[PDB]
Amino acid sequence: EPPPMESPFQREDRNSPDRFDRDRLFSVVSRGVPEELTGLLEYLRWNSKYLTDSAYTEGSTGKTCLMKAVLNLQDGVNACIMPLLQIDKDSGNPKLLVNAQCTDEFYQGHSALHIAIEKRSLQCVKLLVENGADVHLRACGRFFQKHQGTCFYFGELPLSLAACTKQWDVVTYLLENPHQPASLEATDSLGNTVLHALVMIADNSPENSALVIHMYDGLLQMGARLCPTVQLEEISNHQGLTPLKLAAKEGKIEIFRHILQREFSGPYQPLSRKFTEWCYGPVRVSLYDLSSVDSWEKNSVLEIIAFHCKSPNRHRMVVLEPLNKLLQEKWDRLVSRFFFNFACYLVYMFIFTVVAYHQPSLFGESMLLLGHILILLGGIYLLLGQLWYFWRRRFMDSYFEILFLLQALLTVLSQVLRFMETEWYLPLLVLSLVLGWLNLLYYTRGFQHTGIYSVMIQKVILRDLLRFLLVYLVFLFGFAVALVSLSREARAPYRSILDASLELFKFTIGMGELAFQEQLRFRGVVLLLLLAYVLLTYVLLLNMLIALMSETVNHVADNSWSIWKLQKAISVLEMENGYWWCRRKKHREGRLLKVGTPDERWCFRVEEVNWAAWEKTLP
Amino acid sequence: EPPPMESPFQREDRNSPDRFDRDRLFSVVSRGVPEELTGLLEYLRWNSKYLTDSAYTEGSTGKTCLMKAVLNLQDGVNACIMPLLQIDKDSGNPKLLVNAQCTDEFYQGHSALHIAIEKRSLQCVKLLVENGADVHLRACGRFFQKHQGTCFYFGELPLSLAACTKQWDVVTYLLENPHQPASLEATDSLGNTVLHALVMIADNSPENSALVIHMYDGLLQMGARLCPTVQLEEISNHQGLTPLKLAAKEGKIEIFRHILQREFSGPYQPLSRKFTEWCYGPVRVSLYDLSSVDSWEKNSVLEIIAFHCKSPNRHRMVVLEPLNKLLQEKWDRLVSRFFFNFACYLVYMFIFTVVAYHQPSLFGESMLLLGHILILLGGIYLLLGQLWYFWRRRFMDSYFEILFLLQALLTVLSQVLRFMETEWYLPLLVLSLVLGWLNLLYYTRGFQHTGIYSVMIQKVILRDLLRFLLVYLVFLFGFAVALVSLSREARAPYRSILDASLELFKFTIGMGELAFQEQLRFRGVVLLLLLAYVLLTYVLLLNMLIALMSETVNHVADNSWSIWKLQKAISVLEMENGYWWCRRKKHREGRLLKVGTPDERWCFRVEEVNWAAWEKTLP
Ligand SMILES: C=C(C)[C@@H]1CCC(C)=C[C@H]1c1c(O)cc(CCCCC)cc1O
Ligand SMILES: C=C(C)[C@@H]1CCC(C)=C[C@H]1c1c(O)cc(CCCCC)cc1O
Ligand SMILES: NCCOB(c1ccccc1)c1ccccc1
Ligand SMILES: NCCOB(c1ccccc1)c1ccccc1
């Protein structure tokens, strides 16, 4: 268990002229008086130690006397910090105590400047900075990393901590002091910068969103005038993302939306992304920026939303522009490939159904052999394509992206059984055929009127059905074992465990026997136990029905269009790569315009019409 | 792709003493200074060109320099417009540049006056009008026409555009200027007048409704004093409608309600429609106006609501008065025809059932032959009536209006089979019989206690059932093909595709086999595939049930009375024409009263009692 960093009740632990112990030092510093600090210098120069040694620190963490001074800050000002740092300078230690930090696993690197910044005191921050404290000390402990349980994640920097805490004066003093200037370009471990730490502390609540949007714009505006020669929104962390991509991956929708369509009028225009070129009543035409939003480059916002994301908000980022217009422009160009692919799959499935039906038992024979050869070639091509897709991609939207493989694999496996002349090529093949018709359902995603209907009608969750089936199946097996064990002595029904399981399952499709057998010694108890099974199956079925109804009473129904748009987006980004043998050359979208200053950016126009805002701007 | 009409970033395109190119002209006009316009006149008189030629315009659209001047309007005033028009006048061109307009397809006819009116600047409008610009220039491009996608529909006139934008000062200046007076009577393409364009931009939202009601009343009041000799609410567009009928057709309920019962006290009384004659406590008697609201004339509000309308708000216009009282007065007079028609149909159906039941296999014989003759005559009369109804009418309310035809057609077709002595007159006839009993259900619309019950009990949508049946039927056919293909090799059930389809459908009515067949080589896989079919049919049925319940949970239930009133209104307006052989003379309803001034109007009194408003007017 990690010790607390300061505690008024639990004392510190030493576990790793006059005598002046560390306990008296902590006692006089915690109260906060400088008169009783006399005699420290003479004692240190007699014992030939330094104030940052192992004697004067909590050995379990590494907390020095200065951090106890700052942690006992009363009314924002401590009168002991200045003489303590002065006598530390007079001691002549090589390692300065102002920038000392802990060495424990929990609070590694946690300096005094972080404590002074968190205590919302500009005076202690000024006293620490003016006495030679570096402003790039990283807090690398487990307590300052994003994980479940007890943690407070910030960007492991004094400036990041000042940014996450909404205090503006401390951010300004760190950014433009003469004694020790910080930098917005400085990075911690995991590669994050201060524009990343704001994104990773965002939330979908409106207050936290307003906080992080305001402070993100503020830091970007100060980065415009402090270090204009560097693009602050293009520095990459160790995963390879940028702040826009990191907003896309984590599921933070609000700061992602604000970053995607921010606009500042005036001198701060060159760092905008949404430029409006004309507007006529309700219609407004805006030139959005496709820098790392299109799929022509490497991992971008579209692919990160499509594949590398696990969040319930991955279906609402697609709807907001300029992702909606971009994916609509991609779909209106690549719908022909989808329809031709669907027609080829339908022709392959028709020839499969013909071969499976008109088949001899164990010109027409030559036609059927050509059909078998064509089925084998189609199955091996589909198998190669699906194995390519999995190997490149190294969850319900991927559901139909695995069954294809089964409809491939079984098929080719069935055909090698046909080449082995066994008596099992007929089940697996026709089993494949059943799966194949189910596998056609994915191709409803390409048409509007049936795609919206499919997304609207999928009103049950798969995990609920697969849990209920498992519970009912264990129930059936247990009662089947009991019924076989009960009916062994004659005065025959329920002879084996499988037959008794079938005759028990027959009560769910609606045809059960339920009578005196007149062949069993214990036929009354058999009837009683069957009555118990019926009365329990009805409770289980009613519970499942009630649970599904309670699930479907209270949810919003507007997500149908968003989910359909996401499914179409995944299919578009899949087809944009091309086939595994005819790799499609990626076509850059947008036009290279000149906005501001020679600032040449890729731009993409969208024409949005909205009568409500136009009615609002009217008198 | 159409080019933008102005764009600060994308430059214009030429695609269709000192030199003074069009690029320098656009550069100096866009900034907005007049000092650098010097030397233009000498250059134009040396090169013998004009300022509106092809050289000085964006050839892709036809945009002139003046429209670039107005589109770069800063703080409402440009100092360049006045010298530009002055030097255009000094150039001596035959075609004036002030009223020049585009010639592209997308922005056809879009003048500078439209831009100045949209920019909400009275000063630029005054400068354009005073320098000789006609006020009847029509914007005929696709961008200014009502269609899906990107469009801004107004009445293609400067006055209509000033009317749709809620600005009052520009409307007044266009209406009463001495330099170039506009007119409320002027019409664009599609025949619309200014009062029509207000209706076609209306909406059911309260803010837009309040805007359009206020501005409609305002323009009507100004039309009272500018051009009193013309009725502004009687001009017909090219479809033949008036503003009231256009409000009825499009589904705009709020402006339709306001137009139907507007009243102004004082000097503006003669243009009202609802006159109150007396009011005593709560009861109030009002003389509404039946000008184009009754069905005695040509296409009126009642017929346009009844037939020529496709909107979800066609069942709420009937409930609001004076349509409610009018249709109640029609129904209380024409209920006898409905009941006599129902009794005649019931007698015809009883004789049909008797003939279908007491029929010999392949005095009583003469009676049955007379019954057959009467069935043939009734069927041919009903067929002639229904063919008349379709040919004159050249959707669920029309559903029962087609099945009659089938109950006609099959019947007469069955009888000609009886005259052909074939072995198929017995199925079709009795099939007709079944349909006819279903065809009786439409006649529940005439009685209150069962009509409200029928409208209340119709709680399912037909398209959902017809989609679910299609999905389940494809499912059944696919599994039937698989089951026939699997069971071919003996060690018999499931022999043909139709029999296997029937034995698979038997799991839905609640009687399935589900056992080891002991006759098939692959009987275990047959059992497994039947289990798969059962487990999938239950998922599909549960999904359909959940979807219907979710559609049922969250909806308003007050629409039963409105839908029943609409159905009764459709039946009344159908019977008012009369039979196809005894065309009923149309009877004018209301009385010819004299209200205001000799203003003789058809009027219809309604007695409305409402305790709530009377409680509000009390202290
Ligand atoms: C309302 C339910 C869920 C069913 C509806 C069908 C009928 C006949 C019985 C009801 C029922 C009970 O009312 C109570 C139990 C629990 C007692 C089990 C004793 C072994 C089971 C049980 O199926
Ligand atoms: C709760 C439902 C919808 C039914 C209720 C009746 C019973 C016995 C089974 C349930 C059920 C599953 O719980 C899961 C599936 C999907 C797995 C199919 C495997 C081929 C189907 C499936 O009918
Ligand atoms: N009064 C004789 C039956 O009328 B029905 C009826 C009677 C009173 C109130 C409402 C309806 C009726 C019964 C079943 C279906 C439809 C109508
Ligand atoms: N148009 C032919 C059938 O299309 B379907 C359809 C038609 C119109 C609107 C919506 C869907 C369809 C029917 C059942 C299931 C899925 C789709």
PDB file of N, CA, C and O and ligand atoms in Angstrom, chain A residues 462 464-470 472 505 508 541 544 548, chain B residues 532 534-536 538-539 542, ligand 2:
ATOM      1  N   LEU A 462     -27.042  -9.601 -29.322  1.00  0.00           N
ATOM      2  CA  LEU A 462     -26.650 -10.991 -29.531  1.00  0.00           C
ATOM      3  C   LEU A 462     -26.240 -11.663 -28.227  1.00  0.00           C
ATOM      4  O   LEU A 462     -26.484 -12.861 -28.039  1.00  0.00           O
ATOM      5  N   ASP A 464     -27.381 -11.266 -25.199  1.00  0.00           N
ATOM      6  CA  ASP A 464     -28.536 -11.702 -24.416  1.00  0.00           C
ATOM      7  C   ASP A 464     -29.074 -13.034 -24.916  1.00  0.00           C
ATOM      8  O   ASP A 464     -29.364 -13.936 -24.120  1.00  0.00           O
ATOM      9  N   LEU A 465     -29.198 -13.178 -26.235  1.00  0.00           N
ATOM     10  CA  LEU A 465     -29.665 -14.436 -26.805  1.00  0.00           C
ATOM     11  C   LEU A 465     -28.680 -15.566 -26.546  1.00  0.00           C
ATOM     12  O   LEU A 465     -29.087 -16.687 -26.225  1.00  0.00           O
ATOM     13  N   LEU A 466     -27.382 -15.295 -26.668  1.00  0.00           N
ATOM     14  CA  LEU A 466     -26.401 -16.345 -26.432  1.00  0.00           C
ATOM     15  C   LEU A 466     -26.247 -16.702 -24.962  1.00  0.00           C
ATOM     16  O   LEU A 466     -25.802 -17.813 -24.665  1.00  0.00           O
ATOM     17  N   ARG A 467     -26.577 -15.802 -24.038  1.00  0.00           N
ATOM     18  CA  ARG A 467     -26.632 -16.184 -22.632  1.00  0.00           C
ATOM     19  C   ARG A 467     -27.885 -16.990 -22.315  1.00  0.00           C
ATOM     20  O   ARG A 467     -27.818 -17.980 -21.575  1.00  0.00           O
ATOM     21  N   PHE A 468     -29.031 -16.570 -22.860  1.00  0.00           N
ATOM     22  CA  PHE A 468     -30.275 -17.285 -22.601  1.00  0.00           C
ATOM     23  C   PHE A 468     -30.241 -18.690 -23.180  1.00  0.00           C
ATOM     24  O   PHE A 468     -30.743 -19.634 -22.559  1.00  0.00           O
ATOM     25  N   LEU A 469     -29.661 -18.848 -24.371  1.00  0.00           N
ATOM     26  CA  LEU A 469     -29.544 -20.172 -24.966  1.00  0.00           C
ATOM     27  C   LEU A 469     -28.673 -21.081 -24.115  1.00  0.00           C
ATOM     28  O   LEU A 469     -28.993 -22.257 -23.933  1.00  0.00           O
ATOM     29  N   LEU A 470     -27.581 -20.548 -23.566  1.00  0.00           N
ATOM     30  CA  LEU A 470     -26.694 -21.350 -22.729  1.00  0.00           C
ATOM     31  C   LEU A 470     -27.382 -21.773 -21.437  1.00  0.00           C
ATOM     32  O   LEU A 470     -27.276 -22.935 -21.015  1.00  0.00           O
ATOM     33  N   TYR A 472     -30.673 -22.015 -20.856  1.00  0.00           N
ATOM     34  CA  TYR A 472     -31.713 -22.978 -21.189  1.00  0.00           C
ATOM     35  C   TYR A 472     -31.133 -24.324 -21.597  1.00  0.00           C
ATOM     36  O   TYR A 472     -31.738 -25.361 -21.319  1.00  0.00           O
ATOM     37  N   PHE A 505     -37.058 -30.742 -25.204  1.00  0.00           N
ATOM     38  CA  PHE A 505     -37.051 -29.550 -26.046  1.00  0.00           C
ATOM     39  C   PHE A 505     -38.355 -29.379 -26.798  1.00  0.00           C
ATOM     40  O   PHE A 505     -38.706 -28.254 -27.160  1.00  0.00           O
ATOM     41  N   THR A 508     -40.924 -26.500 -26.057  1.00  0.00           N
ATOM     42  CA  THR A 508     -40.710 -25.110 -26.439  1.00  0.00           C
ATOM     43  C   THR A 508     -41.252 -24.782 -27.822  1.00  0.00           C
ATOM     44  O   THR A 508     -41.772 -23.683 -28.029  1.00  0.00           O
ATOM     45  N   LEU A 541     -38.689 -18.268 -20.133  1.00  0.00           N
ATOM     46  CA  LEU A 541     -39.071 -17.580 -21.364  1.00  0.00           C
ATOM     47  C   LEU A 541     -39.738 -16.245 -21.069  1.00  0.00           C
ATOM     48  O   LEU A 541     -39.476 -15.250 -21.756  1.00  0.00           O
ATOM     49  N   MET A 544     -37.029 -13.744 -20.074  1.00  0.00           N
ATOM     50  CA  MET A 544     -36.295 -13.240 -21.232  1.00  0.00           C
ATOM     51  C   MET A 544     -37.131 -12.226 -22.004  1.00  0.00           C
ATOM     52  O   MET A 544     -36.618 -11.179 -22.426  1.00  0.00           O
ATOM     53  N   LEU A 548     -36.153  -8.232 -22.484  1.00  0.00           N
ATOM     54  CA  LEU A 548     -36.016  -7.589 -23.789  1.00  0.00           C
ATOM     55  C   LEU A 548     -36.988  -6.428 -23.959  1.00  0.00           C
ATOM     56  O   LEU A 548     -36.624  -5.396 -24.542  1.00  0.00           O
TER      57      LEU A 548
ATOM     58  N   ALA B 532     -31.724 -25.403 -36.156  1.00  0.00           N
ATOM     59  CA  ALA B 532     -31.276 -24.082 -36.587  1.00  0.00           C
ATOM     60  C   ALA B 532     -32.436 -23.246 -37.112  1.00  0.00           C
ATOM     61  O   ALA B 532     -32.535 -22.048 -36.808  1.00  0.00           O
ATOM     62  N   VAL B 534     -35.654 -23.511 -36.303  1.00  0.00           N
ATOM     63  CA  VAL B 534     -36.524 -23.123 -35.195  1.00  0.00           C
ATOM     64  C   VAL B 534     -35.898 -21.987 -34.394  1.00  0.00           C
ATOM     65  O   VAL B 534     -36.561 -20.982 -34.075  1.00  0.00           O
ATOM     66  N   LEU B 535     -34.603 -22.108 -34.091  1.00  0.00           N
ATOM     67  CA  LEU B 535     -33.924 -21.095 -33.298  1.00  0.00           C
ATOM     68  C   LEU B 535     -33.814 -19.767 -34.037  1.00  0.00           C
ATOM     69  O   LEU B 535     -33.717 -18.717 -33.397  1.00  0.00           O
ATOM     70  N   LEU B 536     -33.828 -19.783 -35.372  1.00  0.00           N
ATOM     71  CA  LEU B 536     -33.815 -18.526 -36.112  1.00  0.00           C
ATOM     72  C   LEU B 536     -35.202 -17.931 -36.313  1.00  0.00           C
ATOM     73  O   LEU B 536     -35.351 -16.699 -36.305  1.00  0.00           O
ATOM     74  N   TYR B 538     -37.603 -18.112 -34.171  1.00  0.00           N
ATOM     75  CA  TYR B 538     -37.995 -17.467 -32.919  1.00  0.00           C
ATOM     76  C   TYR B 538     -37.331 -16.105 -32.758  1.00  0.00           C
ATOM     77  O   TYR B 538     -37.962 -15.163 -32.264  1.00  0.00           O
ATOM     78  N   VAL B 539     -36.084 -15.964 -33.215  1.00  0.00           N
ATOM     79  CA  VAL B 539     -35.424 -14.660 -33.205  1.00  0.00           C
ATOM     80  C   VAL B 539     -36.151 -13.679 -34.116  1.00  0.00           C
ATOM     81  O   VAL B 539     -36.382 -12.525 -33.740  1.00  0.00           O
ATOM     82  N   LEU B 542     -39.550 -12.708 -32.555  1.00  0.00           N
ATOM     83  CA  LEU B 542     -39.342 -11.838 -31.407  1.00  0.00           C
ATOM     84  C   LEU B 542     -38.903 -10.446 -31.836  1.00  0.00           C
ATOM     85  O   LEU B 542     -39.304  -9.454 -31.222  1.00  0.00           O
TER      86      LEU B 542
HETATM   87  C1  LIG C   2     -34.390 -15.832 -26.788  1.00  0.00           C
HETATM   88  C2  LIG C   2     -34.775 -16.277 -27.978  1.00  0.00           C
HETATM   89  C3  LIG C   2     -35.055 -15.284 -29.124  1.00  0.00           C
HETATM   90  C4  LIG C   2     -34.956 -17.775 -28.217  1.00  0.00           C
HETATM   91  C5  LIG C   2     -36.076 -18.262 -27.298  1.00  0.00           C
HETATM   92  C6  LIG C   2     -36.345 -19.754 -27.541  1.00  0.00           C
HETATM   93  C7  LIG C   2     -35.037 -20.522 -27.357  1.00  0.00           C
HETATM   94  C8  LIG C   2     -35.089 -22.015 -26.976  1.00  0.00           C
HETATM   95  C9  LIG C   2     -33.913 -20.029 -27.863  1.00  0.00           C
HETATM   96  C10 LIG C   2     -33.652 -18.522 -27.928  1.00  0.00           C
HETATM   97  C11 LIG C   2     -32.506 -18.266 -28.953  1.00  0.00           C
HETATM   98  C12 LIG C   2     -31.277 -17.823 -28.454  1.00  0.00           C
HETATM   99  O1  LIG C   2     -31.127 -17.608 -27.074  1.00  0.00           O
HETATM  100  C13 LIG C   2     -30.189 -17.588 -29.303  1.00  0.00           C
HETATM  101  C14 LIG C   2     -30.311 -17.790 -30.676  1.00  0.00           C
HETATM  102  C15 LIG C   2     -29.105 -17.520 -31.618  1.00  0.00           C
HETATM  103  C16 LIG C   2     -28.197 -18.776 -31.694  1.00  0.00           C
HETATM  104  C17 LIG C   2     -28.612 -19.639 -32.916  1.00  0.00           C
HETATM  105  C18 LIG C   2     -27.646 -20.841 -33.064  1.00  0.00           C
HETATM  106  C19 LIG C   2     -27.894 -21.523 -34.430  1.00  0.00           C
HETATM  107  C20 LIG C   2     -31.525 -18.243 -31.186  1.00  0.00           C
HETATM  108  C21 LIG C   2     -32.617 -18.480 -30.339  1.00  0.00           C
HETATM  109  O2  LIG C   2     -33.804 -18.932 -30.931  1.00  0.00           O
END
